[model samples]
Target chain A: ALTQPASVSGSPGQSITISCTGTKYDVGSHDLVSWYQQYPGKVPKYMIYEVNKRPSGVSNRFSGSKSGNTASLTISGLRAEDEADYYCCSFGGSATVVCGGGTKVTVLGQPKGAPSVTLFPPSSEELQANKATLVCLISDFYPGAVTVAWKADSSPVKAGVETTTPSKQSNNKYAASSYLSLTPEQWKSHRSYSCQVTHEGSTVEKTVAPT
Target chain B: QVQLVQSGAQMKNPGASVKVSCAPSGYTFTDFYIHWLRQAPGQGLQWMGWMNPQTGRTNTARNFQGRVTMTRDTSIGTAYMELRSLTSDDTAIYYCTTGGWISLYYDSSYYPNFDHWGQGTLLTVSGASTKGPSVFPLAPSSKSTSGGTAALGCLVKDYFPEPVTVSWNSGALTSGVHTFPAVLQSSGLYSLSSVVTVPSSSLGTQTYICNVNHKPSNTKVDKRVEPKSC
Candidate 1:
């Protein structure tokens, strides 16, 4: 039977568990095992797999270790669904990969604490008339609960926005998308913009400036 | 890259009709066929059918054809489908998609299944003008006997469209075993009570399982028991 790893790395010093199960067949001969993440109402994304090979464009905060037939996926920053369900896949010759019964990640302790706040665009930029819609896109988040807000001179601005749940890729990690629409004038004068995420009682924020 | 974003939940009632939409983004809507899927509450996935947005040609799984319609609008990059003669069994989570690649060259047939998916939208069915019951029990009774008839009660709540089948299973249920049907409720939600007279010798060794089959999602099974004595 497939077995998931007993322990995983969440946010720094925080512990989590990544569990997996093998099929009725022997998977010991396979050279690689993989893990993926699927957020609620979204597709799957690739996390870590094949012993410990990190995919390109992925952060180093996520790592893996294996013992016997089990592999673990540890994320340094444990977010809400960092504790989400995870699947482990095994691949050998001929590009054929066998997936194990997935395991859910569970936070074992308090989070490493909220992310730091970083703001952008200390000054406002100019907006051109009839320009294309100015949009702020936030990419790469652990859980799918992050939110983006437009601000003008430190005050909240009402704007049309949309958010998407995280999605999974063939390799089995997760990704999310959020978009905000701004008029030409609004885009030019917006100051101190931010994307705020509340993960496990910690509020992490990121700010950007218009060019 | 292509993406399909589903609309929000839809609430309707028995004998009524409802239609929902799944909007495509990031790619030409006509480049690929749109596949509609159903997933009932707390159930697995089900294949509804596919519609070619370019030609408007439609094909549905054998089980879903008479109940659903698939249409599209190339101008707006939107695919539209409708469920006619709605029932409580129709309550489910529906999704639309374009890029699910399955090998179709085998056995002179195009065997298609969802290889990719869209985020699902929950559809709840209820009474004529309002949302239906959200939760109800499947257990019709608490007491049953081995050699005597036992009533299996089922309570379903908040299910807008009723389900297709409510069945029973034994712990030793084989791979090919089929289930029996229970009662159909008027609210579009359902509770099926099945009376099975147990055999004396098999009382202690058998377990009864209740299964609910809704489209879009595979099937849901729940287990229960009847004592040797009432």
Candidate 2:
């Protein structure tokens, strides 16, 4: 498999280079290195192909190249729209192909919006089944990056929390939801259940109590 | 314009079974392959497998071979996966993706480009007890001059109920940090690895710390490493 830096960040209009490292069996030996750009919940668009060739409709600012075992994708004069996840792929020998883990390009100082968080209690049907589930809906956020955590009263609750990756809305903003699973008895014992969302370093929290 | 919508959260007993669905729109569903993946509570993504919508053929990952069943309804443009004999380890956020097609020079097998993705469906398995994780000391890894980077690795294992959070002392250090998903060992426990890298020069006589938070037991494990020279 190919490996990439976990993330890279740059200011708008600045250039950032993300490297995809593989072995001689892949990027080092093949001219099939390809790059794709993907936003949260959206389809990945093919960008660079056959090492450095950009297909029609792609901007000239996006370029690719390879040296030895590493392939590089350099986005020049980066725009706010360029803030997305980028991935690289190469064909290893003997019918094997692999993809880079993925790199996140963060355009610093770009416009980002805070999420509107709402908490929903478990349904009566769930209570009847001896189960309790809390839902945290985070909506209308930009840049598609957010962190969610659950709290039982004053302490952090981790075991049963499941937060989805941000999904792009039709309005161009992003939405995501988190779930907290618990027993009905445990939910009744806790003073409150809190849903905390952190976006652009700002945290917004919404809480719910047993009815 | 392609879109994939998945089912909502679900709760099931340990011995029960669960079926999750992903429906696609805005394109010909039979023209592309649909792949499945999952992310345990706080872990990274795990590739479960893919299904060919046209031929109704499925390719299952080794870890999920016998227990996972993939089915597709071409008429309705939806793909379904049924996992049997549920356990706490099977609890995760299952996702489906639209795969791209490319004819390679060497092989006849289909490779997925993972173009579009679903929002994810959360499956929560109940009636399981909690198990706290054990965090090991941070150790130094390889140093690369060409990339001008130095790395440190941290391992957390023997935890249960899925998902463990890891943090670094180098300012959250989101960038250059690679954390893998928790793997279910044969003992029914889980293990994961996190690696953080920095500029080689930055590691000159520096001390770095790794913090693992096992929230179920309220355990906070911390380990530090000193890289005297890079």
Candidate 3:
């Protein structure tokens, strides 16, 4: 009966630590805190097989510790590769195996620079046929991590927004795109909408009023 | 260096069927196993069985044992997934992946690794009909009291007719807002979220709005900010 609930986040060149307090039963039952690393569309790797030990060639930056009923994993320095989903699973004590929820550990990258974004407004005929989508193209971000959001009239808009997983470019950088589905009526009107991109520890907002 | 590149998307109607294709590159076909995967309506990833195209010694997954069929072409180094008896529930993203060709396994303890993957193929059995996605309530999750960043989850339920989108706005009031990537809810459908930051000074006092639109239904269903209950 253990549950791990936490998130660990940091920027490039910085070091961060996370903990998983479940997966085992009874007191400081076991010295093992298994850490799993997962990336989108890929299988996970148990970075820490049993307790604090690293899996062979892992970075020395990773270390672990636990007290009472909790265990922790610490990384000395944050890098682009560290920006992933981290999970802390117990060694599965005599009780049922418990794993903390995914901790979206984000390490803001610092390689390419700020992202360049462009919004593709819907076409007229498409809107006429009741088919229209707004595109937000984000390119030129470093460490391949960024955030793209939308808004209408200076307020936050959270409707019909779909974004593709960040696609790595030739430069080892990353590019991503998102789209917003709107009705012909919404497109027919003149209202201010925006595409906001956040990367490199800063935020950039682009406003567009479709004509 | 084995790679499994999958096909694009397919749209069909109930009772109709679909065949998904996967072409392999960077390695020989028969050398590794060709595995298949399924995404249940709300459940994003489901472990499907694998087969030895040349020998097919392994057993297929129990769930799709009868519903799906798999075949291989050793010469072209490609594999296939033919899912018949299509239904709205059958509409999902099918993927082909695997660890390696031969018996990468030894004894009972095994290597649980599917190093390579394919670009998923989306199959929609909506019959050219227009139906919106099943969206759960939009919520403000992952909230931390210290940071000014406000995270909200626009959870789409066991949705239909793949490829949905969302947006956000505060009627000209919110600032520093951004959207995170869309995450597939394990049990079903898709869910995406966005975050807005306004100087910690404005926390709780500010009002923001979120909207999600599915082109199929042109759904007017959107959410508003109520300091309490969302």
TM-scores, all models, native as reference:
0.35, 0.48, 0.46
DockQ of each model vs. true complex: 0.02, 0.04, 0.04
Model 3 residue runs over 4 Å out of place are: A1-76, A86-103, A107-211, B39-44, B84-89, B100-110, B127-230
lDDT of 3 by residue, B186-213 (tens): 3334444444444444437655566666
How is the predicted docking of candidate 2 categorized under the CAPRI scheme?
A: incorrect
Name the DockQ score for candidate 2.
0.04
Where is the poorest 10-residue window by lDDT in model 2 chain A?
Answer: A90-99
Local accuracy of candidate 2 as per-residue lDDT tens digits, B1-230:
87899876566779799888999999988877787867664343556777778777777766777998989987898899999999989888787877655223332223435557787776768775567875544334342212767666565656765556788884566776645455555556666656666677777566678888765445777777554222
* Candidate 1: residue A72 Cα off by (Å): 16
What's candidate 3's DockQ score?
0.04
Candidate 1: which stretches are off by over 4 Å?
A: A1-37, A41-82, A85-211, B1-3, B100-119, B128-230
* Tens digits of lDDT, candidate 1, B46-108: 556777676677777666669888888778878887888877677777877553232233220
Candidate 1 per-residue lDDT, tens place, A1-211, comes to: 2555433444535645565544333345543565566554445455664568775656676787766555666676566446555666554223223444455454554323222222222112112323322222222333434454555556765554444444432222333333334556556566545555454455555555455
Candidate 1, DockQ to 2 decimals? 0.02
Q: Once model 1 is optimally superposed onto the true structure by TM-score, how far is the C-alpha of residue B189 displaced, in angstroms?
A: 16
